[PDB]
Amino acid sequence: GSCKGRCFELQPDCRCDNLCKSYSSCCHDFDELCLKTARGWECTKDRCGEVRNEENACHCSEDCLSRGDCCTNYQVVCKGESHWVDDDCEEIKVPECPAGFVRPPLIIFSVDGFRASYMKKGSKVMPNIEKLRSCGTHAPYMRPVYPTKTFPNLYTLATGLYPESHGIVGNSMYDPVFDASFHLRGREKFNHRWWGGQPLWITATKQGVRAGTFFWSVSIPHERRILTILQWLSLPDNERPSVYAFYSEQPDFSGHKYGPFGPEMTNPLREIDKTVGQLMDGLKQLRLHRCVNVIFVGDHGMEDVTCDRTEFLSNYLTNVDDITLVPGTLGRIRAKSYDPKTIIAALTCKKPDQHFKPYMKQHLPKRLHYANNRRIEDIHLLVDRRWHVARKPLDVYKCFFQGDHGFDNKVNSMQTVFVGYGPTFKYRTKVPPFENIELYNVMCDLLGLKPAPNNGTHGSLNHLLRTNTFRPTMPDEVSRPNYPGIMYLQSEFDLGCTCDDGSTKERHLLYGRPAVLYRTSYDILYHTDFESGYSEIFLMPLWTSYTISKQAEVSSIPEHLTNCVRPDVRVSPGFSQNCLAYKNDKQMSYGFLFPPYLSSSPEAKYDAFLVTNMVPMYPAFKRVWAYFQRVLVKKYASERNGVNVISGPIFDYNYDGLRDTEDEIKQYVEGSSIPVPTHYYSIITSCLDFTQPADKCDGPLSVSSFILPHRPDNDESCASSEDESKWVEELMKMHTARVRDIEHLTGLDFYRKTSRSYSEILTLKTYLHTYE
Ligand SMILES: *[C@@H]1O[C@H](CO)[C@@H](O[C@@H]2O[C@H](CO)[C@@H](O[C@@H]3O[C@H](CO)[C@@H](O)[C@H](O)[C@@H]3O)[C@H](O)[C@H]2NC(C)=O)[C@H](O)[C@H]1NC(C)=O
Ligand SMILES: O=C(OCc1cc(Cl)cc(Cl)c1)N1CCN(CC[C@@H](O)c2ccc3[nH]c(=O)oc3c2)CC1
Ligand SMILES: CC(C)CCC[C@@H](C)[C@H]1CC[C@H]2[C@@H]3[C@H](O)C=C4C[C@@H](O)CC[C@]4(C)[C@H]3CC[C@]12C
Ligand SMILES: [Ca+2]
Ligand code: NA
Ligand code: NA
Ligand SMILES: [Zn+2]
Ligand SMILES: [Zn+2]
């Protein structure tokens, strides 16, 4: 019944752990013994050498070091030591830990709503943080997951999983299997049923590594959280955790009230830095300041949003009482106790300035990875940055907030911070921006743990670390290609088609053949202008590769070839598409993967009309694809000193972000076994050093990629009635993708033969071109 000698113990009989408040199960004496605040949190000169008083918050007695409960500034005030922040960076070449430490501890210092750009304020406001950032390893920014809300991001940090995989797809969710709702406020969130994957503290415990608590009752002051962490670190080897987390509700709280750019934001940032100072001072006191790896990380940024920039569903829908809306910086809509198609139509391009866009979740940009969970409603609203969506005018209250977050994770204002400091991180090193899904693997590496399966690309962040305990290995090809020669005659083909008619590898396949990582049968097909990997199962290329020089010439499809499709004599009639299917399918047309517009000669252009280069395309989609092919590829080649393009189909009918089996394809061209892609990708590569052409590049590569939804209309693009130069590129930028996203969706593995290290290539594959 007592907390005596058990305050913040690590293990209905009453509790003294840091969460007992939140379960209201603290012992009677918990507040009096575990939450002392007398004399506050700093030693002063007159307190030095005091007789211990057990009522003090922390201690300045001679014995306090033997007890591990000195105030964090005790050595500075009472033994003439300097503050950690006043010492120069000294490179930490190896961990300097007490004997009997078996690995360097990790302290995750997470800051709620810490926008990346707040680092620009410097050592005047945040001297401790600025030193961590200077002396350690930092990124200019770290990309959060969608939605850019607290719980989905913190749990992503902890698990390496997209929200659709870990299950915390929002701060609020409804689970139809449970018939219950999860919210920030309430007891429901404490139920383990909501939480999937395997968070870091569990991964650690399962592998015999002790974790401190990762959650702090809001009642526990920040200074006490630091002292508790420091006290735990002074535990004997058999009890001491190896991983700890601190969380700060700032600067989020202030960011919401004043917005991200308020002068009132300086004080919260000063307070966070002061807390960082206390930890680093505390660590220095314990001589652990060259032992512990410290991660300073946020969950997401903060945007200017005021209640005056709110769209109301009641101005679109004829009855908003039939719907339940999860509102704000995103929208999720389901039936109250109603028809989806009607709802989407009523929300689509109805006002010129319309500040959100409806999507069926499967049509959301694939880069969001926000579909494959029963908690994500079919109907989704992407809200423009700076705006909210709500059900009706009465739902806005007057404004109480000037900042918010939750928007699309490529939005600048949503980006957050990463700093790594300690023996295992590099010294004075800047690394490119990366996604928070990657951190779990790193944290596992830092702790000697095997990560549970997750969505990071293990190895992609090796360049953050002085020492790597993980070397990635390139996956093995599963299917070997065939290289068919000419073995069928024109007259053997009955495809209903009609037409009025080996340095390929050096030129067109710059980074090696893509490896097929699933069992299938496919053919390598060579031509003057392009190479392709043609699937006998799907009757089309898995990929088509070609290189367009800066100086390449765009030509038209001549009239006499407008409807030309030619049989490919290297491939059987039985493993080819047929033109009758397209003639019969009233809604479906076709396009070409290698564009006829970029043929090297009139003679070569005939290759582009081979049936093995043809893919099913809605006429609506052809507007987008034809523009990309006719105008944008030349534009990119001209800007980037040539480009290599790999394009192809994706099939993801079950919207899990993973390539479909034949079994999962739900749509075929009428009367045929020609599957309809859900998306078309392209990967566009050139030299990072643009003074070198794409085909003669000695160094780092530069990539941008997209996964375009293969839609029968352009309802997504409200300006699609206009010329393609007004909207298609905007469409493409929205559906920007990582190469890795394409790899998951195709079963292909790119960049197998380059002059770059595999870890560098993994970094390249995880890059997202954001266009901000
Ligand atoms: C993000 O990472 C997660 C975790 O690795 C991936 O989810 C995992 O996906 C696999 C493959 O679908 C699931 O394994 C499979 O489970 C089924 C059904 O139980 C079984 O029939 C198969 O034999 C196979 O083992 C696995 O459950 C699942 N893990 C989760 C949800 O935690 C996910 O695919 C990744 N997402 C992307 C877009 O790459
Ligand atoms: O200490 C914690 O975890 C630290 C941690 C670190 C790491 Cl790396 C991983 C993990 Cl898994 C957890 N806690 C997490 C939740 N937090 C209150 C949330 C709630 O008060 C809140 C906060 C901000 C909001 N913004 C908003 O719009 O609504 C909000 C609601 C306090 C307890
Ligand atoms: C003040 C409030 C915001 C605090 C709320 C914290 C709450 C969400 C935490 C408390 C306990 C946590 C669970 C616990 O660590 C065990 C597991 C096992 C793991 O495999 C899945 C996660 C889960 C259920 C934790 C989820 C987060 C919980 C409920
Ligand atoms: Ca799939
Ligand atoms: Na047709
Ligand atoms: Na349109
Ligand atoms: Zn947050
Ligand atoms: Zn917030």
Curated annotation (Swiss-Prot):
Cofactor: Zn(2+); Ca(2+)
GO molecular function: alkylglycerophosphoethanolamine phosphodiesterase activity; calcium ion binding; lysophospholipase activity; nucleic acid binding; phosphodiesterase I activity; phospholipase D activity; polysaccharide binding; scavenger receptor activity
Annotated binding of Zn(2+) 2, by residue: D252, H256, H405
Swiss-Prot/TrEMBL site (Essential for catalytic activity) positions: K765
Outcome after substituting D112N: Abolishes lysophospholipase D activity
PTM per Swiss-Prot/TrEMBL: N-glycosylation, but not furin-cleavage, plays a critical role on secretion and on lysoPLD activity. The interdomain disulfide bond between Cys-349 and Cys-718 is essential for catalytic activity.
Catalyses which reaction(s): a 1-O-alkyl-sn-glycero-3-phosphoethanolamine + H2O = a 1-O-alkyl-sn-glycero-3-phosphate + ethanolamine + H(+); a 1-acyl-sn-glycero-3-phosphoethanolamine + H2O = a 1-acyl-sn-glycero-3-phosphate + ethanolamine + H(+); 1-(9Z-octadecenoyl)-sn-glycero-3-phosphoethanolamine + H2O = 1-(9Z-octadecenoyl)-sn-glycero-3-phosphate + ethanolamine + H(+); a 1-O-alkyl-sn-glycero-3-phosphocholine + H2O = a 1-O-alkyl-sn-glycero-3-phosphate + choline + H(+)
Glycosylation sites: A346, N455, A719
Disulfide partners: C3-C16, C7-C34, C14-C27, C20-C26, C43-C60, C48-C78, C58-C71, C64-C70, C89-C135, C97-C291, C307-C399, C349-C718, C497-C579, C499-C564, C687-C697
Known role: Secreted lysophospholipase D that hydrolyzes lysophospholipids to produce the signaling molecule lysophosphatidic acid (LPA) in extracellular fluids. Its major substrate is lysophosphatidylcholine. Can also act on sphingosylphosphorylcholine producing sphingosine-1-phosphate, a modulator of cell motility. Can hydrolyze, in vitro, bis-pNPP, to some extent pNP-TMP, and barely ATP. Involved in several motility-related processes such as angiogenesis and neurite outgrowth. Acts as an angiogenic factor by stimulating migration of smooth muscle cells and microtubule formation.
Name this polypeptide is given: Autotaxin
Organism whose genome encodes this protein: Rattus norvegicus (Rat)
